[PDB]
Amino acid sequence: ISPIFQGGSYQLNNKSIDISSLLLDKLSGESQTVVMKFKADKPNSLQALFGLSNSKAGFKNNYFSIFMRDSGEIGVEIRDAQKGINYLFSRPASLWGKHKGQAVENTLVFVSDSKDKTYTMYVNGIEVFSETVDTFLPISNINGIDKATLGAVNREGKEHYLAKGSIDEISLFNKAISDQEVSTIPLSNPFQLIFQSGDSTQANYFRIPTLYTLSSGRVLSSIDARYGGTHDSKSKINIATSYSDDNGKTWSEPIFAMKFNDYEEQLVYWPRDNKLKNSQISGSASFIDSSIVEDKKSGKTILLADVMPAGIGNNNANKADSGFKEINGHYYLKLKKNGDNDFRYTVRENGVVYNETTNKPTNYTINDKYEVLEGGKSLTVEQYSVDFDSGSLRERHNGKQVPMNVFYKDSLFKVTPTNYIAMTTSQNRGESWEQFKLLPPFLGEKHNGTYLCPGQGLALKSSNRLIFATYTSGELTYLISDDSGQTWKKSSASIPFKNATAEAQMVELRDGVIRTFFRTTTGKIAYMTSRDSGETWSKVSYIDGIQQTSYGTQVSAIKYSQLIDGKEAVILSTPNSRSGRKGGQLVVGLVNKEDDSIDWKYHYDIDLPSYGYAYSAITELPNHHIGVLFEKYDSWSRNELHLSNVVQYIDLEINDLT
Ligand SMILES: COc1ccc(CNCCS(=O)(=O)O)cc1Cl
């Protein structure tokens, strides 16, 4: 199983390289494998890395290519006019450009398999497409092929899709190699995956990364395990965690911090065509947006996430309602029973379901896990599974029974179709998690729940104060606990925005001084300061020198433990672009101890300015390196939905940033 052609160190400088004499007469049979290690840190908009063409007059559409875009996208064309075949397979956000100054060696493995009638592309260990066709076109069975080309496609005597870049190594095989052989091919990745397709979560997609360094040196990570593509809603989403005991080098197989069982955890390949991509798992309860903090006093780890029941909608579900009823000075969770038109029930002390019309209790109780019992007996519902077999999404019962949960569609008692905030705890630094409890309303009976700011909570150095940032319309709503997260109070901070996704992260500049950096609708990152450990908050200011899009992106922030250029330092992670979610940066600021102002002195580009960078998580690792877990793609763009393994982790050192 050795190569028919092996070549190396080609410089693609807007001048194609001819290798027809070397390669073309080696090609035989209808299955081929291409293996290519290449760099491209200054690509053109659209460029071919490799081409097989009929270069003769009138055959401009008879060619095979492997091409890329300056967006990071990779693909192949397979075209033959006489066969009436023009195939194009691609996937956005498949490449790296740069890392720590140097251009990245990408490893591309393209497999064209005549027997299975399938083409498959891997880049840097990740399968980015696998396509089966009715009519298969062998890549060198294109009518009249007479040219083999590097750095362009030769069409009618001319160079199309001229490439800037280089190909350190290229190999060809007259075989379709096995998925196993592929995994034996060494890579040169600048990144690693913590969460990934096929792992214990069985989720094909991930979004919203978090990181937090625990006091034992264990680094913890949480994330949305998203099942119905990368949709926020409607969908199935669990909250999954993993940890690292070796400074980010290896990571534990993930577990769930928050999960529902009304729908099966399915690894699904969600459609990316324009007709089907907005398909949504519509009948599932789910979570979204996790946040982590560690309490120095009890040693617990605390994780919060937004929760939604199955019946949640977009509009008319259910703003102006918290889902709780105030009775005296206490909040009880509202329920609605099957046939009723209103919420005539509540969950009082020790889960007893009271009938509000008669104020008399029922023979139903609600347990620790929000499950329904009648006379102490576990009621159950049937689970759903999703498929695209009928050429469209179906959600159907699957025979398996699961505990009846008040967040479910099939449940006898239902919660208000709005958003809530749930909290869980681990006493073993992420090895297991308790059943979550719902947090009570903070803005009164008649106000839908605020939105958790994904990332980290803040543990104040000089006390036992724990703070979680949330957002609602017109304000940041901080959640403050002084008793290991047993009780919470809110601290409201007005912002100049109605209906913003004001995702906020905090750093402590010095004892009792919190700066919160948050996403806005102005194209600039905002901030406010507290000087009383979160009791009161300043007016809002903005950062210049960094740009976001109008709709904006989540920003992550940490106080660096070490001085830089003699001054105390803060690190921000964010896209730097007013067009999309690309141009990822780590920005280093030094604090002016006279006014607590921040001079943003250093900008580190995570990859190319045109390459995808979205939601992110930063942590200072015990060895003082920096770990970054991030969405390496444009998670806003309607053209980059439902990609697998784009959430990635890198290790950086401070000198890398300066
Ligand atoms: C509680 O449910 C939600 C909370 C936040 C959000 C917003 N997520 C924003 C992500 S992004 O659109 O900016 O990429 C959506 C839902 Cl459905």
- Is residue 500 within 8 A of residue 519, CB to CB? The reply is yes
- Which residues, listed in sequence order, are joined to residue 328 by a DSSP beta bridge? none
CATH fold of the domain at 1-190? Jelly Rolls (2.60.120)
Task: Tell me, in Å, the resolution of the deposited structure.
Answer: 2.6
Cis (ω within 30 of 0) for the bond into 15?
no
Residue nearest to atom 5 of ligand 1 (CA): 451
CA distance 26 to 3: 10
Q: How far is the CA of 239 from the centre of ligand 1 (A)?
A: 15
CB-count exposure of residue 396 (10 Å: 0-12, 13-18, 19+): exposed
**Cα dist from 253 to 63, 202, 240, 243, 616, whole Å:** 44, 12, 10, 8, 21
CA distance 186 to 178: 15
Q: How far is the CA of 617 from the centre of ligand 1 (A)?
A: 17
CA distance 498 to 516: 18
What single DSSP character describes residue 80?
E
The two tokens of residue 195 are 């969460």
Query: Ligand 1, residues 208, 232, 287: which to mutate, most atoms within 8 A of Cβ?
Result: 232
Is residue 434 lining ligand 1, measured as CB closer than 6 Å? no
**Cα dist from 348 to 74, 322, 356, 362, whole Å:** 56, 16, 11, 11
- Cβ of 392: how many Cβ atoms within 10 Å? 11
Q: Tell me which residues are annotated as active site.
A: 232, 503, 615
Judged by DSSP in three states, 329 sits in coil
Is 207 one of the annotated binding-site residues? Answer: yes
Is residue 306 lining ligand 1, measured as CB closer than 6 Å? yes
CATH fold of the domain at 191-319+418-658? Neuraminidase (2.120.10)
- Is residue 281 within 8 A of residue 409, CB to CB? The reply is no
Is 79 one of the annotated binding-site residues? Answer: no
Cis (ω within 30 of 0) for the bond into 61?
no
DSSP 373-396: EETTEE-EEEEEEEE-TTSS-EEE
- Cβ of 528: how many Cβ atoms within 10 Å? 20
Residues forming CATH 2.120.10.10 domain(s) in the chain:
191-319+418-658
Is residue 295 lining ligand 1, measured as CB closer than 6 Å? no
Query: Ligand 1, residues 234, 288, 308, 439: which to mutate, most atoms within 8 A of Cβ?
Result: 288
Q: How far is the CA of 451 from the centre of ligand 1 (A)?
A: 9
Q: How do 5-13 and 106-113 pair as beta strands?
A: unpaired
Cβ-Cβ contacts under 8 Å for 102 (sequence gap 6 or more): none
- Is residue 624 within 8 A of residue 562, CB to CB? The reply is yes
Judged by DSSP in three states, 293 sits in strand
Phi and psi torsions of 549, nearest 5°:
-75, 165
CA distance 196 to 127: 12
Homologous superfamily in CATH for domain 320-417:
Intramolecular Trans-sialidase; Domain 3 (2.40.220.10)
Residues forming CATH 2.40.220.10 domain(s) in the chain:
320-417
Short-list 135, 120, 140, CA closest to 50: 140
Judged by DSSP in three states, 183 sits in helix
Q: How far is the CA of 241 from the centre of ligand 1 (A)?
A: 20
- Is residue 527 within 8 A of residue 543, CB to CB? The reply is yes
DSSP 221-288: EEEEEE-STT-SSSS-EEEEEEEESSTTSS-PPPEEEE---SB---------STTTTT----S--EEE
Determine which helix (DSSP H) or strand (DSSP E) holds 169, and give its type and residue range: strand 164-173
Residue nearest to atom 8 of ligand 1 (CA): 232
Is residue 288 lining ligand 1, measured as CB closer than 6 Å? yes
Is residue 266 lining ligand 1, measured as CB closer than 6 Å? no
Look up tokens 């576990």; give the residue: 378
Short-list 492, 603, 364, 355, CA closest to 346: 355
CB-count exposure of residue 327 (10 Å: 0-12, 13-18, 19+): middle
Helices (H), 512-632: none
Residue nearest to atom 11 of ligand 1 (CA): 636
Is residue 289 lining ligand 1, measured as CB closer than 6 Å? yes
- Is residue 578 within 8 A of residue 528, CB to CB? The reply is no
Residues forming CATH 2.60.120.200 domain(s) in the chain:
1-190
Judged by DSSP in three states, 568 sits in strand
Is residue 233 lining ligand 1, measured as CB closer than 6 Å? yes
Is 519 one of the annotated binding-site residues? Answer: yes
